[PDB]
Amino acid sequence: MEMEKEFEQIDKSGSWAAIYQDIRHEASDFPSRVAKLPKNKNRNRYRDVSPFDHSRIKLHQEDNDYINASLIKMEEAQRSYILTQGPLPNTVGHFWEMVWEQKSRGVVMLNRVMEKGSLKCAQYWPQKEEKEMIFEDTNLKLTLISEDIKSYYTVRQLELENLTTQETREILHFHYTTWPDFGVPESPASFLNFLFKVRESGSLSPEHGPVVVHCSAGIGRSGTFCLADTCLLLMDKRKDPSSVDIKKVLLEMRKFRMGLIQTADQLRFSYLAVIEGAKFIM
Numbered sequence: 001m002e003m004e005k006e007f008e009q010i011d012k013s014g015s016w017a018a019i020y021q022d023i024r025h026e027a028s029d030f031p032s033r034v035a036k037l038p039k040n041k042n043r044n045r046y047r048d049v050s051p052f053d054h055s056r057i058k059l060h061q062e063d064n065d066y067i068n069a070s071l072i073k074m075e076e077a078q079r080s081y082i083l084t085q086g087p088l089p090n091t092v093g094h095f096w097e098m099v100w101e102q103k104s105r106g107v108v109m110l111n112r113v114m115e116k117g118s119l120k121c122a123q124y125w126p127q128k129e130e131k132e133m134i135f136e137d138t139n140l141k142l143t144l145i146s147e148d149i150k151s152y153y154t155v156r157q158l159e160l161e162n163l164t165t166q167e168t169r170e171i172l173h174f175h176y177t178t179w180p181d182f183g184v185p186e187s188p189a190s191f192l193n194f195l196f197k198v199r200e201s202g203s204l205s206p207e208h209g210p211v212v213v214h215c216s217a218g219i220g221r222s223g224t225f226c227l228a229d230t231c232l233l234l235m236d237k238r239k240d241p242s243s244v245d246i247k248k249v250l251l252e253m254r255k256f257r258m259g260l261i262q263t264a265d266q267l268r269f270s271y272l273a274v275i276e277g278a279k280f281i282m
């Protein structure tokens, strides 16, 4: 079926939970043996969210190459993304090592450091220009260059220096700051505006390594971001845009990381975002 009318048909019939449970039943199951090794317990935020072995990002290190991060490679859309958990106190150096080694240009953050009165990720970037951060375990230096605070999101320019080689690179930090503590946004308008700002920066384009996207677990809000982006790109590329099937795209993405889209409300919000976004594109 088309999307917008499939949408009203699920609303009128109140069957979002049944649609979402079908997706969960059909999703791929691949091994995640490296994630479950005992030496990696303090590298995982949640015991039930792990990268598959076949798609995990490897650190360029011979001691321990493990990070909770996955490469999502979308062949028809010609887009790639790295989806990862919010960094932990003992993985902030690994996080920036990955950004460096994968040649990423942008980092997309969809959570606040504290939500619901608890810490959802480490404070992994500097908040003042004159107070830079040094990650001694991976030999990197990170400096805040500029910050632009808007009503729904903040954009930061950061300098990452590889202290072994003295090479430097400019990294863009795109921080969506207004996702509610509970539920999903009422309108997709600010989320779509944010997606378009990431696109306009070049961070999603083939001349760079894959964008790094995270929330707390790296599957819920993060899944909504890449699902909406890929569906809108396919609607531009194909002769028949009504052939784009958001459930099929989501199942393809779940071949590369488990659990993408965590609730039926997140699934409905993803439909809404693609539907409204397709009208603005034209």
Ligand SMILES: CN1CCN(C(=O)Nc2ccc(F)cc2)CC1
Pocket: 102, 103, 104, 105, 168, 169, 170, 171, 208, 209
């Ligand atoms: C002001 N300009 C913007 C480009 N720029 C940069 O560093 N790009 C980049 C390339 C490759 C990579 F992996 C990360 C960033 C700094 C100079």
